[PDB]
Amino acid sequence: AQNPNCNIMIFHPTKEEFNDFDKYIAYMESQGAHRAGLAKIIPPKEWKARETYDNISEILIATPLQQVASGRAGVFTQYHKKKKAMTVGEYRHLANSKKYQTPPHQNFEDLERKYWKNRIYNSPIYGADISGSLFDENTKQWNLGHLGTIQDLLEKECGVVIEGVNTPYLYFGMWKTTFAWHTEDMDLYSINYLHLGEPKTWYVVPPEHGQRLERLARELFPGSSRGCGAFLRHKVALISPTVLKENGIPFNRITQEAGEFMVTFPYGYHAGFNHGFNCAEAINFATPRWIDYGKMASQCSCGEARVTFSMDAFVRILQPERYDLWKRGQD
Numbered sequence: 001a002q003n004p005n006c007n008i009m010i011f012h013p014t015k016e017e018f019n020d021f022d023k024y025i026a027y028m029e030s031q032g033a034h035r036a037g038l039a040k041i042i043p044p045k046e047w048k049a050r051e052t053y054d055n056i057s058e059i060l061i062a063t064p065l066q067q068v069a070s071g072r073a074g075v076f077t078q079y080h081k082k083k084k085a086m087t088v089g090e091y092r093h094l095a096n097s098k099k100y101q102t103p104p105h106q107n108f109e110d111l112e113r114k115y116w117k118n119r120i121y122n123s124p125i126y127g128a129d130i131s132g133s134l135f136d137e138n139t140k141q142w143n144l145g146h147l148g149t150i151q152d153l154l155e156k157e158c159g160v161v162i163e164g165v166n167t168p169y170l171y172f173g174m175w176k177t178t179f180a181w182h183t184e185d186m187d188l189y190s191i192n193y194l195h196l197g198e199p200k201t202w203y204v205v206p207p208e209h210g211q212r213l214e215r216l217a218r219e220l221f222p223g224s225s226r227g228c229g230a231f232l233r234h235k236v237a238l239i240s241p242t243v244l245k246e247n248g249i250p251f252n253r254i255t256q257e258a259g260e261f262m263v264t265f266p267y268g269y270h271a272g273f274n275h276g277f278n279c280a281e282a283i284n285f286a287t288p289r290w291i292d293y294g295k296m297a298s299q300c301s302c303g304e305a306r307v308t309f310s311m312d313a314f315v316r317i318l319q320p321e322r323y324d325l326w327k328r329g330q331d
């Protein structure tokens, strides 16, 4: 078995190898990459996502989210308070202000220490989940707006034709902006490109050990667990590496820098934080190997997780027993 310790693997495809996206994902999996739940892909040196970022300040962040924490430094939840609209130029100036900017630090490790010590005492503002793309239309390789759709994968593998579309999302971050522990909708893959700015640190649990994280989460967030049988789908709970280590949960960490892709694999729980002002683009995708994960994915039916139009069909075809109850939650 390849990569039996479930380490995060880093790939350096050539420009030739960067032509066929599906084929490269399958290659990475042949090397055991998926066992970690997360992989890094450094694009060939000849590739670029677009020519410059010089003209992005006029993108609107219609609903910036203030991420307010509750709990203790290593075990907390976050709620998202909606703020007034602002442009990316306005958001970048806010990220760079004295109130919100990255503190002085020695290296990524010192910054990580500061994040886990001090995150709860601040409420950074995250411009998350903005439909759109920063890839130039002429970028033909690993253009996250030109990928094969999940609906088309489901049709190729299973013969069934369904409604729905699959488009990318932009994320504008600042120091301490946080993504809570989660797997993707329907335990899909994700791919995330860091277009510009400061790094993003990731934590990940191997898919084969995801239920150990779930059991710890039920213990640490016991009222949330009684409220919903899949409350991690709410995307609000944080658990630090120190707490994970104290509880014997297998995990890994890695820092993504501008110009790099990350892939999350089906049922790979992940969480993380931004080091400073940045912009990422991410989208869900599927392969043939995902289908069985999609059939087994948990679902939030308490009604809190409230997700996309296209998830309806996935549930309806892959999980027809749950259909009914899951749609009572979503309506």
Ligand SMILES: O=C(O)CNC(=O)C(=O)O
Residues within 6 Å of the ligand: 171, 178, 179, 190, 191, 192, 264, 270, 280, 282, 283
């Ligand atoms: O970048 C972020 O805030 C969150 N991204 C992801 O969870 C992802 O790409 O799967």
Ligand SMILES: [Mg+2]
Residues within 6 Å of the ligand: 055, 056, 057, 058, 059
């Ligand atoms: Mg603009």
Ligand code: NI
Residues within 6 Å of the ligand: 182, 183, 184, 190, 264, 270
């Ligand atoms: Ni994710």
Ligand SMILES: [Zn+2]
Residues within 6 Å of the ligand: 227, 228, 229, 230, 231, 233, 234, 300, 301, 302, 303, 304, 305
């Ligand atoms: Zn729920």
